[PDB]
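Re: Re: ligand-bound prediction request (bumping)

Still looking for help on this. To restate: I need the protein modeled with chloride ion bound, output as structure tokens. Inputs repeated here so nobody has to scroll up.
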Amino acid sequence: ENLYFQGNIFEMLRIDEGLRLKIYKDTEGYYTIGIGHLLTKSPSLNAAKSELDKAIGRNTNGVITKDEAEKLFNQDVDAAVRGILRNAKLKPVYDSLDAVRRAALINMVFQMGETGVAGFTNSLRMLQQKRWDEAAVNLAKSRWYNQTPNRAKRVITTFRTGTWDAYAMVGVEVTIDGMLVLADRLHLVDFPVALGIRPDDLREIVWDQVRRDLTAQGVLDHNGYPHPTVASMVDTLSRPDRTLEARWWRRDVVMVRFVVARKDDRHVIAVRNGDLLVLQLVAPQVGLAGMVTAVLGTADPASVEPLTGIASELAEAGLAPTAARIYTEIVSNPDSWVEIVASQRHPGGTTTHTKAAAGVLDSAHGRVVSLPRIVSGELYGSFLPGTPQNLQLALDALVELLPAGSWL
Ligand SMILES: [Cl-]
Ligand SMILES: [Cl-]
Ligand SMILES: [Cl-]
Ligand SMILES: [Cl-]
Ligand SMILES: [Cl-]
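Reply:
Sorry for the wait, this slipped through. Here it is.
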């Protein structure tokens, strides 16, 4: 599903710049709200509260809604486009670009300013000549690219493709200690046990180096607070409403554990590789099957018949000779084996995990998915060819075993 990924300039910059609903202080000391909407230059806080109330037409106490931040953002986009169209170095390139690549260019102005963007003289001519691949390579040769790697990558991919796909799943990579530093800063505990994120003077020198490193990546801001998008990722993993928790065994090599977590409308993928954690904030348009596929990769479905009239562990103790030899090789010697359980959080702070699990098998004959069923009080198992549709079916069945019976 979701073969045409729909983005827009506001969601793009919400992710890259970060949406702040509370008055904020950038590095230069200026008070800011929304997506980098400058409130005042004054070194004073109260001046900022005055200016914010004027722009909103409401007494706000330094707190706005997402809709209000979008209003301010639209004015800033106009101001940035107005500036671009009056800059002889940027107007020709902007006029030639499609709407998506225009948003990528507006994205850069938001970050480094109209003059800084005009300094990419080589890349700007490549974009005007529709040499997408060359511009993408050239842009990566800037200090901008290394200063903010995750943002520049997405913007450069957007310049290359002219699509929104770079924002379907946006990822950050942190060490287990960096994750603990973020959680400590955000008042977060109760992470999925499957990720193994567990809680003086020696710890302080260790974390002050990690904090310095996170600041260098733009994961922590100038006062040591996380980027709002990273904050969103880590928060979603703390006390999620739903999770898929997976154990992933790879014949080609240690078991990898990863999680898909939902909290309200946010989805986060968390893969742990040793002492490394990869977090991905996932756009609502993506489906559960797509999130799992993002971790496991694509594979050709194994041309097999269904094998659902199977009781629990009876599978492991009326098929064809051919259909029997295929299935035997799949389970006996699989290239890869994933088991996925699901959980849900209850209002009272407790959680339920399924006992049954959905399965994904890769082999020389193609991928296979295993769908769990509780019928008449006994656990059933059904093997199906591993298409993204059947994977979604296996995950739907798994989730239906939760007290709520749905992912919502
Ligand atoms: Cl350049
Ligand atoms: Cl090119
Ligand atoms: Cl970044
Ligand atoms: Cl900052
Ligand atoms: Cl169960």
